[PDB]
Design a protein around this ligand. Structure first.
Ligand SMILES: Nc1ncnc2c1ccn2[C@@H]1O[C@H](CN2CCCC23CCNCC3)[C@@H](O)[C@H]1O
Lengths: 625, 303
């Protein structure tokens, strides 16, 4: 149910050791590839000429076993950053040798420690290795939650432990990691093995780490407590962190010696399994989202592009959305047609963007529950979906052209409407061009006609996510601007990330819009209070919409309509990550720009430093009218 | 005759006892099987020939350190993270396990018997230092004083509660376990080896990773000599009353120094790393050294 390896620093026979460990229930073995005490000379005679096999043979395991079962460990004497020149050079040579052997064996991962501040040379050797030959070992950088220097016992009589609240202090190990991965240029091969100790830092510290690429969490045997029955278990605080780490499908590694000697061994594992079988179960949204975690997609342009049959089908299988549309229209039919007027008053309802008809059936469902009468028009421009409508029309219905195959901005309406009903909203509300589409249909809304929805508002929040920054680089394409990938949004089920400040409103649009200008262009300045040292990699986007009065849809996380599938957040990247200190304000500026052919967003950070303006003139990203 | 067939290549430890017999420990640090052995040579000059030895045995894992405990007993720091007590049988033909306790979380790097011979301290790559009761076969105390690997521990000659430790955190800690805060720091290049003076309660030598040997007084900074071109692995004071200091190193050389740290002997007999040195109790100017080149060398030290 949960994936876990065993960390050993002692392996007398590889086969007996792997077998014992496979028996215990572990999936892999982190072990040394050279003996951890077998220091080697590369320069000075006579020890450079030490004979004999430098380590054990690749033939001791199958290729399949090397490729799936074994994580290598850098030798603990290797100190590329030593202040002694001879050790620095032996260590350079020895690190390339052990990495080369790991590549030679096809290991899936290799563990290197970040156990001090200055890892510049470590970084530079690993970077050279990555740029040498054709190999695809992952590099797991073993970094503690708490530096050893900060969890030492206060038993040195003339060197006491720094006592009071030391604020950037128990964030030192994050800066170790950040300096290292910045030196290595955010390489996608360099991830984190986070080593957990007896004590824990801030919820904020643990929050930053969960925006970082954690592939493994390392649990020492020593941090486990004992229950009555004599089994190993964890503090309620350590249980919280497991619960969060399981929510990133990280691998668990058990390190150190057996400390529960009445209770066999595999019991540490048994306990991780226990915690795992015993988290709250996925909600409806979490089940459906599984598979989409940090997968970047192009936002749909349903105006420019004719949606596929199977795209409509995911938007249709969203009962809570159509349930809320049904209620909004019901409440509208009741405010519009008094009870005396019940059977004389036919309300004219038009569905604008009817697709394959679910808002039409919502309008019907509404009409029976409100017991008022309606005359229905369904306007769709996608002639593919028009086939689905016109077949349903000729088969059911039989009365009225109902379905009209037309762009709602050209359509000559037989008649003015009481109510226009539409769902032309993307992940950023107005990025499917709802404003332009409704402004062009407005002229056939009666002077007191209602638009459902009546309002929407986009929201933004700054984020950190070094995974999401790499998914964006990976979007570089031949034959365009090498930076174009950063100047466009992505619909993405944001997962491996940190929300740096609470969402605030960006752009609002009302319908109908009787301001004699409309002007759907927009400029907004947003100030985000921050409270960690972090990297800004971009802004998450969300929206909310008023369908009618108090009937709303949201994907803003704090008001998220429960169990609603149709829309994941959007991400606006920035080209260069921006360091932010605790206490600093992130200032961001968004424009909604347009000409008669295109709408786009430009955006810039102005605090605590300026970015370049992103997407100037829609040079990298436009939404076609 | 008597023991395992093939003693492992990498000679780690050599220590004479009172009657002049040689204790050898070894690891295999390469090849299929990464393990360890103990040997008694009631004739030094034969060693390391397995056939013509008095006793020996297979350990589960590598031997990183060991020390004699009195006459019968051998105390072992294992790669397995275990501290082991082995003992000679009455006939000193067999070496039997008395205890194997897995209490450290990584390799045990260094071990040292206290004053009284009843207790011992271990240091480990797990960063911890531990005080053992050898009769009760339990850890009495565990200290996380250091911020990195423990390179060396060294029991005081005469005081059970006092010993030195040093670490890759650039600290030399002087410990007295009768204080609430038992450790005190003493002034670097990383310290790599420790020995107490056998005639001054107050004094000790330390070797650094850069090849310098340093003489330190508790009472008082230092006095120093650039003796080696790399890591000082070991410092063992000779058994004389104005004693010599044997220094060994990864530069594959042994030096013997006077009390002013001036050079008297130098040997390049070794072709790999020199791991240990022990002075004959019969002939206070026989010095025996061992190395990863599998040589046991017998030097006559000019005195
Ligand atoms: N000017 C026009 N005139 C008429 N029809 C128009 C437009 C602009 C868009 N459409 C259509 O509206 C529908 C919107 N669909 C329905 C479910 C999925 C969704 C809504 C949520 N976001 C993704 C698209 C589609 O069927 C479009 O083809």
């Amino acid at each position: 149910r949960v994936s876990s390896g065993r960390d050993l620093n002692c392996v007398p026979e590889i086969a007996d050791t792997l077998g014992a460990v496979a028996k215990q229930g572990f999936d892999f073995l982190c072990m040394p590839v050279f003996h951890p005490r077998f220091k080697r000379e590369f320069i000075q005679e006579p020890a450079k000429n030490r004979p004999g096999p430098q380590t054990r043979s690749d033939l001791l395991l199958s290729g399949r076993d090397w490729n799936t079962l074994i994580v290598g460990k850098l030798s603990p004497w290797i100190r590329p950053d030593s202040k002694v020149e001879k050790i620095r050079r032996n260590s350079e040579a020895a690190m390339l040798q052990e990495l080369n052997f790991g590549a030679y064996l096809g290991l899936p991962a290799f563990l290197l420690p970040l156990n001090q501040e200055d890892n510049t040379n470590l970084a530079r050797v690993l970077t050279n290795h990555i740029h040498t030959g054709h190999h695809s070992s992952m590099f797991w950088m073993r970094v503690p939650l708490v530096a050893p220097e900060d969890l030492r016992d206060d038993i040195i009589e003339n060197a006491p432990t720094t006592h009071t609240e030391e604020y950037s202090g128990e964030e030192k190990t994050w800066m170790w990691w950040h300096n290292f991965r910045t030196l290595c240029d955010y390489s996608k091969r360099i991830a984190v093995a986070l080593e957990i100790g007896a004590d824990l830092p801030s919820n904020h510290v643990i929050d930053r780490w969960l925006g970082e690429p954690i592939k493994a969490a390392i649990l020492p045997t020593s941090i486990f407590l004992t229950n009555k029955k004599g089994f190993p278990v964890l503090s309620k605080m350590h249980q919280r962190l497991i619960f969060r780490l399981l929510k990133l499908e990280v691998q668990f590694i058990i390190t150190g010696t057996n400390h529960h000697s009445e209770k066999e061994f595999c019991s540490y594992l048994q306990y991780l399994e226990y915690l795992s079988q015993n988290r709250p179960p996925p909600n409806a949204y979490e089940l459906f989202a599984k598979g989409y975690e940090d997968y970047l997609q192009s936002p749909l342009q349903p105006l420019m592009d004719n949606l596929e049959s199977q795209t409509y089908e995911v938007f249709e299988k969203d009962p809570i959305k159509y349930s809320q549309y049904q209620q909004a229209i019901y409440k509208c039919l009741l405010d519009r047609v008094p009870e005396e007027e019940k059977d004389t008053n036919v309300q004219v309802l038009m569905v604008l963007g009817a697709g394959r008809g679910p808002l039409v059936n919502a309008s019907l469902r509404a009409a029976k529950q409100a017991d008022r009468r309606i005359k229905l028009y369904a306007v769709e421009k996608n002639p593919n979906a028009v086939v689905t409508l016109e077949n349903w029309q000729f088969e059911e219905w039989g009365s009225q052209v109902t379905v009209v195959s037309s762009d709602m901005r050209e359509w000559v309406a037989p008649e003015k409407a009481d109510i226009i009903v539409s769902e032309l909203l993307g992940s950023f509300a107005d990025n499917e061009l709802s404003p332009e589409c409704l402004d062009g249909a407005q002229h056939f809304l009666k002077d007191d006609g209602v638009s459902i929805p009546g309002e929407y508002t986009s929201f933004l929040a700054p984020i950190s996510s070094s995974k999401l920054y790499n998914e964006v680089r990976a979007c570089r394409e031949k034959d365009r601007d090498p930076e174009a990938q950063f100047e466009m949004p992505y619909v993405v089920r944001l997962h491996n990330f940190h929300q740096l400040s609470a969402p605030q409103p960006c752009f609002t649009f009302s319908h109908p819009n009787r301001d004699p200008m409309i002007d759907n262009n927009r400029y907004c300045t947003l100030e985000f209070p921050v409270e960690v040292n972090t990297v800004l990699h971009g802004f998450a986007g969300y929206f909310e919409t008023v369908l009618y009065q108090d009937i709303t849809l949201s994907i803003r996380p704090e008001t998220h309509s429960p169990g609603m599938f149709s829309w994941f957040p959007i991400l606006f990247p920035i080209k260069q990550p921006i360091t932010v200190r605790e206490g600093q304000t992130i200032c961001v500026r968004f424009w909604r720009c347009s000409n008669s052919k295109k709408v786009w967003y430009e955006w810039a950070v102005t605090a605590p430093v300026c970015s370049a303006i992103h997407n100037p003139t829609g040079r990298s990203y436009t939404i076609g009218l | 005759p008597n023991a395992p067939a093939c003693m492992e290549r990498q000679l780690e430890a050599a220590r004479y006892r009172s009657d002049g017999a040689l204790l050898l420990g070894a690891s295999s640090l390469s090849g299929r099987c990464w393990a360890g052995s103990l040997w008694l040579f009631k004739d030094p000059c034969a060693a390391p020939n397995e056939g013509f030895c008095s006793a020996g045995v297979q350990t589960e894992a590598g031997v990183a350190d060991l020390t004699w405990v009195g006459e019968r007993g051998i105390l072992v720091a294992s790669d397995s993270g275990a501290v082991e007590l082995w003992e000679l049988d009455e006939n000193e033909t067999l070496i039997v396990s008395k205890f194997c306790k897995y209490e450290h979380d990584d390799i045990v790097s260094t071990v040292s018997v206290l004053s009284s011979g009843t207790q011992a301290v271990s240091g480990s790559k797990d960063i911890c230092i531990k005080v053992w009761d050898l009769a009760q076969q339990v850890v009495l105390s565990s200290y996380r004083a250091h911020a990195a690997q423990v390179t060396c521990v060294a029991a005081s000659p005469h005081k059970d509660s006092v010993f030195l430790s040093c670490s890759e955190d650039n600290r030399i800690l002087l410990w007295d376990t009768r204080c609430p805060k038992p450790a005190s720091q003493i002034g670097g290049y990383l310290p790599t080896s420790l020995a107490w003076h056998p005639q001054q309660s107050e004094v000790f030598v330390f070797g650094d990773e850069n090849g310098t040997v340093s003489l330190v007084d508790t009472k008082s900074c230092v006095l120093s000599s650039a003796v080696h071109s790399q890591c000082v692995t070991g410092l063992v004071f000779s058994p004389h009353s104005v004693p010599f200091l044997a220094s060994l190193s990864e530069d594959c050389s042994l030096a013997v120094l006077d009390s002013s740290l001036s050079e008297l002997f130098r040997s390049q007999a070794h072709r790999d790393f020199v791991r240990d040195a022990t002075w004959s109790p019969l002939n206070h100017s026989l010095l025996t050294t061992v190395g990863w080149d599998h040589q046991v060398v017998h030097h006559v030290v000019p005195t």
